Amino acid sequence: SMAEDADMRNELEEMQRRADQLADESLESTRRMLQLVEESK
Amino acid sequence: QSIINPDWNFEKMGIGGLDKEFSDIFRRAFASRVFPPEIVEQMGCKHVKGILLYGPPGCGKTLLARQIGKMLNAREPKVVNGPEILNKYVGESEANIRKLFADAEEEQRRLGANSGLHIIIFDEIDAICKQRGSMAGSTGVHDTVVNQLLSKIDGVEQLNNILVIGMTNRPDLIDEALLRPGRLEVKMEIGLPDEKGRLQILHIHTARMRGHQLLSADVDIKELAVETKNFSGAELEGLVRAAQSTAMNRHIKASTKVEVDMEKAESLQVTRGDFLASLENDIKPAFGTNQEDYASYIMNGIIKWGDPVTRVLDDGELLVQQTKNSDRTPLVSVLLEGPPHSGKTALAAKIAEESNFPFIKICSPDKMIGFSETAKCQAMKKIFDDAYKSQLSCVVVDDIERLLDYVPIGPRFSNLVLQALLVLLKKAPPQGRKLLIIGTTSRKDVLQEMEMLNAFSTTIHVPNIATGEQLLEALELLGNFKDKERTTIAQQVKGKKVWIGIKKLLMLIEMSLQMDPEYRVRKFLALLREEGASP
Amino acid sequence: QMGCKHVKGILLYGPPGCGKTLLARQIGKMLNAREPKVVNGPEILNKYVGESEANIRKLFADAEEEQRRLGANSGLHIIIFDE
Numbered sequence: 001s002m003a004e005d006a007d008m009r010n011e012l013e014e015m016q017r018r019a020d021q022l023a024d025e026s027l028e029s030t031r032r033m034l035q036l037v038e039e040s041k
Numbered sequence: 042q043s044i045i046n047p048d049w050n051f052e053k054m055g056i057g058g059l060d061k062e063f064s065d066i067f068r069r070a071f072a073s074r075v076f077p078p079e080i081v082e083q084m085g086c087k088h089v090k091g092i093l094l095y096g097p098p099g100c101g102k103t104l105l106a107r108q109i110g111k112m113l114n115a116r117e118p119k120v121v122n123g124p125e126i127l128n129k130y131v132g133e134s135e136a137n138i139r140k141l142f143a144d145a146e147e148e149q150r151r152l153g154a155n156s157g158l159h160i161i162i163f164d165e166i167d168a169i170c171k172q173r174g175s176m177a178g179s180t181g182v183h184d185t186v187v188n189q190l191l192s193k194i195d196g197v198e199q200l201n202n203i204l205v206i207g208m209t210n211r212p213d214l215i216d217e218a219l220l221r222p223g224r225l226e227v228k229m230e231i232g233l234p235d236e237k238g239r240l241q242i243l244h245i246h247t248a249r250m251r252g253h254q255l256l257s258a259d260v261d262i263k264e265l266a267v268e269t270k271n272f273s274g275a276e277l278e279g280l281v282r283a284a285q286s287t288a289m290n291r292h293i294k295a296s297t298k299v300e301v302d303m304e305k306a307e308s309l310q311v312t313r314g315d316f317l318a319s320l321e322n323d324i325k326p327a328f329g330t331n332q333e334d335y336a337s338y339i340m341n342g343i344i345k346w347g348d349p350v351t352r353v354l355d356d357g358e359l360l361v362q363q364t365k366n367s368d369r370t371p372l373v374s375v376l377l378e379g380p381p382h383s384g385k386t387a388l389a390a391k392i393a394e395e396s397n398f399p400f401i402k403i404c405s406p407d408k409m410i411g412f413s414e415t416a417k418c419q420a421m422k423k424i425f426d427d428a429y430k431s432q433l434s435c436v437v438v439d440d441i442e443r444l445l446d447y448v449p450i451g452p453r454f455s456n457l458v459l460q461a462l463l464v465l466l467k468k469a470p471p472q473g474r475k476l477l478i479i480g481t482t483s484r485k486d487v488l489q490e491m492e493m494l495n496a497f498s499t500t501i502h503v504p505n506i507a508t509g510e511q512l513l514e515a516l517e518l519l520g521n522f523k524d525k526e527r528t529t530i531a532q533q534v535k536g537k538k539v540w541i542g543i544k545k546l547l548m549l550i551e552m553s554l555q556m557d558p559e560y561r562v563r564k565f566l567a568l569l570r571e572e573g574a575s576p
Numbered sequence: 577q578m579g580c581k582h583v584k585g586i587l588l589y590g591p592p593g594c595g596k597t598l599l600a601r602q603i604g605k606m607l608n609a610r611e612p613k614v615v616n617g618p619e620i621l622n623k624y625v626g627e628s629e630a631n632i633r634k635l636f637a638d639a640e641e642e643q644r645r646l647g648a649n650s651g652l653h654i655i656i657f658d659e
């Protein structure tokens with residue numbers, strides 16, 4: 001009388017890597033491009 | 042390209058004592074893949090895609106499986122060792138099973154009728170092929186895998202380039218649906234070898250070692266084969282290995298340190314003495330006999346103190362001869378009865394030993410202390426089932442009265458054991474074999490009243506000591522009291538009658554012997570007088 | 577030349593406290609083999625399906641591999657069970 005094994009509930013897909021600061025950096029460059037393009041006119 | 046390897050040869054296989062089984066397996070599995078495909082197509086048949094094997098441990102199943110797997114000039118056979126396809130994630134077990142057959146399906150759909158050949162080995166098929174419950178509330182632990190396997194082996198799609206093989210020890214537990222002629226058709230049993238089989242096995246496991254002069258001329262292979270009776274396959278190899286090890290150990294030494302001789306190791310030889318030694322105390326057969334039980338039951342031997350012992354032995358020999366050389370009566374039983382302490386078990390054991398049968402087993406209550414009736418029934422069933430696997434057998438039931446759990450008060454006893462024994466004393470063995478059963482008891486009237494004497498075919502009587510002359514003869518044979526005291530004791534006992542069993546006589550002698558040197562006879566006489574007769 | 581393999585198992589039994597573990601440890605440490613893999617009683621049982629078989633198979637993996645990659649010149653391995 002030993003509770004038999006149980007099937008692994010399932011998989012809950014969840015993926016997180018290095019986006020935060022990589023895209024914040026990406027942004028800081030576009031802003032400066034915009035400023036320069038504005039300045040030229 | 043031929044299916045069989047170009048250089049394959051039967052003698053290289055290294056198998057002995059299974060010629061007929063191998064021939065039949067070949068005939069039923071591969072005969073259709075040898076002649077050109079035109080005739081096979083004309084006959085419009087389909088090749089078999091299943092095999093099965095079973096038997097007692099140590100008979101050469103895995104060896105045959107591996108040999109048949111290697112016999113084909115095709116891809117390398119896959120393998121599965123018991124529950125090696127189970128998984129915890131949902132549905133992965135079925136995907137694992139399906140992955141096995143993917144290559145065969147791709148081959149079939151691609152190349153058609155000239156496709157290749159594939160093999161698989163579901164070793165320990167019994168582990169994950171238990172019978173389906175077929176009832177709500179009894180959900181099986183492995184049911185989806187069984188259903189997937191059944192669907193894949195023969196389902197909505199057809200295959201003709203596959204072959205499955207199984208091996209197990211319990212052929213009565215495999216799922217019923219997995220044994221019809223469409224999935225697993227050819228099934229065979231592997232049993233204990235015979236004399237010629239043992240000779241062949243010993244010859245194959247010795248040919249190589251004879252190549253480099255490692256056998257003296259004292260080894261008589263035929264004598265060794267005849268001596269060893271009803272030995273499983275593995276035990277011959279075990280005996281040979283142990284003999285080689287013990288022979289080699291003599292040249293080497295050690296104790297305090299480890300060293301090896303270099304001037305004697307080049308004259309190594311193995312003789313019959315080491316073989317004998319090991320045969321005696323190295324390998325203990327499983328379906329045979331050994332002297333330990335006889336030494337335990339014949340502790341004080343047998344002494345011929347009169348006529349009845351000879352008549353009893355002659356009757357036993359006659360019954361043994363009848364069972365051995367008869368065909369209309371393959372089941373004969375004899376019941377030994379007598380007063381308590383008359384020494385009846387020893388005579389039964391002596392008859393069983395002298396019978397000279399390959400297989401002898403003694404079922405006694407000594408090993409069943411405290412058991413429940415179900416355990417006793419199971420043990421008896423197992424023993425009798427084991428006794429059905431030999432061309433000659435003999436079983437001895439000891440102390441029936443104590444087996445039934447009898448007690449005069451009430452009286453009380455166990456009905457189930459009595460019913461089992463009654464049904465089990467009329468079951469004829471499988472056709473073509475023989476059996477012999479010997480019983481014992483100390484209360485004949487009880488059994489006669491329970492309607493049990495109509496199951497036994499005969500009956501013998503074992504009497505006690507009846508006259509002073511036989512008591513004197515037994516005393517002289519034992520050799521405890523010398524002539525001087527013998528005269529005095531005889532002068533008393535000669536003029537009367539006695540009633541004692543030999544075991545009680547031994548105990549009385551032992552008890553008397555503890556007194557002073559010149560007080561033994563008087564106390565012995567007093568004890569004998571106090572014993573009484575009680576006819 | 578003899579064409580024989582080696583025995584694969586040894587079983588020791590006796591009443592508690594007579595010197596079985598000491599003999600086992602000494603015989604294990606005597607040989608030049610690597611450290612003996614030890615199983616402290618039933619420590620391979622698990623609740624999830626198919627974990628006990630994987631754990632059992634894991635023990636023999638290294639020795640099996642080594643045999644495959646060397647052949648007759650492989651090293652020696654030991655496995656010690658408890659209870």
Ligand SMILES: Nc1ncnc2c1ncn2[C@@H]1O[C@H](COP(=O)(O)OP(=O)(O)OP(=O)(O)O)[C@@H](O)[C@H]1O
Nearest residue numbers: 056057097098099100101102103104242274275278
């Ligand atoms: N006819 C035979 N000739 C030579 N060796 C044999 C023969 N039959 C069995 N053997 C021996 O069998 C040994 C392998 O064990 P085997 O496969 O026979 O056990 P098994 O019957 O499969 O046991 P289990 O009941 O666990 O499956 C080998 O050492 C092989 O020499």
Ligand SMILES: Nc1ncnc2c1ncn2[C@@H]1O[C@H](COP(=O)(O)OP(=O)(O)OP(=O)(O)O)[C@@H](O)[C@H]1O
Nearest residue numbers: 339340341342343344381382383384385386387544
């Ligand atoms: N010639 C003989 N005949 C019978 N028994 C003998 C003889 N010589 C010695 N014995 C001893 O008699 C003993 C009788 O066997 P055992 O101890 O089983 O007694 P039993 O009277 O047959 O049994 P039970 O107590 O169940 O009635 C045997 O152990 C054997 O040692």
Ligand SMILES: Nc1ncnc2c1ncn2[C@@H]1O[C@H](COP(=O)(O)OP(=O)(O)OP(=O)(O)O)[C@@H](O)[C@H]1O
Nearest residue numbers: 588590591592593594595596597598599600601659
């Ligand atoms: N032959 C021996 N000589 C000296 N010491 C011994 C001997 N046998 C056992 N011992 C002592 O046994 C002690 C440890 O015994 P241990 O409990 O390991 O043995 P065991 O009987 O195999 O155990 P277990 O009862 O757990 O199965 C060691 O300290 C050692 O001193």
